[PDB]
Amino acid sequence: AAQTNAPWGLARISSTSPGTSTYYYDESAGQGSCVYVIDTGIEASHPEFEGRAQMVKTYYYSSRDGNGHGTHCAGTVGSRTYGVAKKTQLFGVKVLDDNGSGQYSTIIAGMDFVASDKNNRNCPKGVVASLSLGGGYSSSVNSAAARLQSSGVMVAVAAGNNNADARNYSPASEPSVCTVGASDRYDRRSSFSNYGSVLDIFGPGTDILSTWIGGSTRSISGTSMATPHVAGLAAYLMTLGKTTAASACRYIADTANKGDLSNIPFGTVNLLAYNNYQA
Ligand SMILES: Cc1nc(N)sc1-c1nccn1C
């Protein structure tokens, strides 16, 4: 399938070169997979989600996304226009308040919730979790992410926006999950993206158009935007039968576009997420 005039990041993930604008992908489109978006919530009523999104859990007075961040990330995973995996099922878990903040204890509870809740959902092709959040190093936060991964969920986490080594941030520093840095449309490391040996992969993260609250759209930047590209890619590849939740991060790294990014510090992977789709 070909989506013309796609957001640059979608075009990038199906291309051997920057500077194109059509996204190419197998029409299976993540059908039969599920992606949990652990964030500020999801505006599931947005027409872009086509009834495929729903809120499954909140720790606050509402499950609504009063911020926009979670809706934007969910749109990059799976919206019809802005999403990588256009037929996946999206499940929102609201661990962050409407200012975008959340206690680590609530975030940990949300990860353990997903590890159990997947057994209440129909996801024959596999389960992914996208975590566009983080703070300073916490062994307990890392262990929660490791449990979620161990339970059979492909966990993708943001590297962070500190222009620093991600080893000092959580869950970015957990080795067993997929830690995602951000790149721009010219194949440069995004200026804010964390780096370091703990990164597994880069995805598009600067000037990413996606869904927003109030039935709207907007373009924003962050490792929060790169992470759902990778989460959606994992769901897409799992539906295709090319990999599993346990191995999807390593498969994405093995099949990535290699050596094409600039301003990557010595010792950080130079790997850009790529679907290897041959139309
Ligand atoms: C973080 C970084 N980005 C580059 N293009 S070089 C570089 C770096 N190497 C060693 C230290 N730093 C700060």
Whole-angstrom Cα distance, residue 242 to residue 244?
A: 7
Q: What order of strands is seen across the sheet that includes strand 178-183?
A: 53-58, 89-94, 33-39, 126-131, 153-158, 178-183, 201-204, 271-272, 257-258
How many other C-beta atoms can be found within 10 angstroms of the C-beta atom of residue 151?
18
Rounded to the nearest 10 degrees, the angle between the axes of helix 69-78 and helix 223-239 is 30
Report the relative pairing of strands 23-24 and 2-3 from DSSP bridges.
antiparallel
Q: Kindly list the structural domains of the chain, giving each domain's residue range(s) and its CATH number in brackets, ordered by start.
A: 2-272 (3.40.50.200)
Q: What ligand 1 atom has the least distance to the C-alpha of 266?
A: 9
Residue 177 is labelled as binding a ligand: yes
What is the C-alpha radius of gyration for the chain, rounded to an integer number of angstroms? 16
Resolution reached, in Å?
Answer: 1.2
The residue written with tokens 């997903």 in the block is 114
What DSSP assignment string belongs to the chain? -EETT--HHHHHHT-SSSS---EE--TTTTTTEEEEEEES---TTSGGGTT-EEEEEESSS-SS-SSSHHHHHHHHHH-TTT-SSTT-EEEEEE-S-TTS---HHHHHHHHHHHHHHGGGS--TTEEEEEE---EE--HHHHHHHHHHHHTTEEEEEE--SSSSBGGGEETTT-TTSEEEEEE-TTSBB-TT--BSTT--EEEE-SSEEEEETTTEEEEE-SHHHHHHHHHHHHHHHHHTTS--TTTHHHHHHHTSEES--BSPPTTS--EE-------
Residues with CB under 6 A from ligand 1: 195, 263, 265
Burial profile 78-94: b = 16 or more Cβ within 10 angstroms, e = fewer:
bbbbbbbbbbbbbbbbb
In terms of Cα–Cα distance, which of 187, 38, 181 is closest to 115? Answer: 38
Contact (CB, 8 A) for 223 and 181: yes
Whole-angstrom Cα distance, residue 84 to residue 188?
A: 21
Q: Which two tokens stand for residue 127?
A: 């389960």
Side-chain half-sphere exposure of 45, counting CA atoms within 13 A: 6
Q: Which two tokens stand for residue 242?
A: 């090319």
Start-to-end CA span in the chain (Å): 7
Tell me, in angstroms, the distance from the centre of ligand 1 to residue 119's CA.
43
Residue 157 is labelled as binding a ligand: no
Name 236's Cβ contacts closer than 8 Å, sequence gap at least 6: 25, 26, 28, 29, 30, 33, 84, 85, 88, 275
- For residue 181, report the phi and psi dihedrals to the nearest 5 degrees: -90, 175
Which residues on adjacent β-strands are paired with residue 257? 272
In terms of Cα–Cα distance, which of 232, 228, 221, 233 is closest to 257? Answer: 233
- For residue 260, report the phi and psi dihedrals to the nearest 5 degrees: -100, -10
Q: What ligand 1 atom has the least distance to the C-alpha of 263?
A: 5
Which residues form the catalytic set? 39, 69, 224
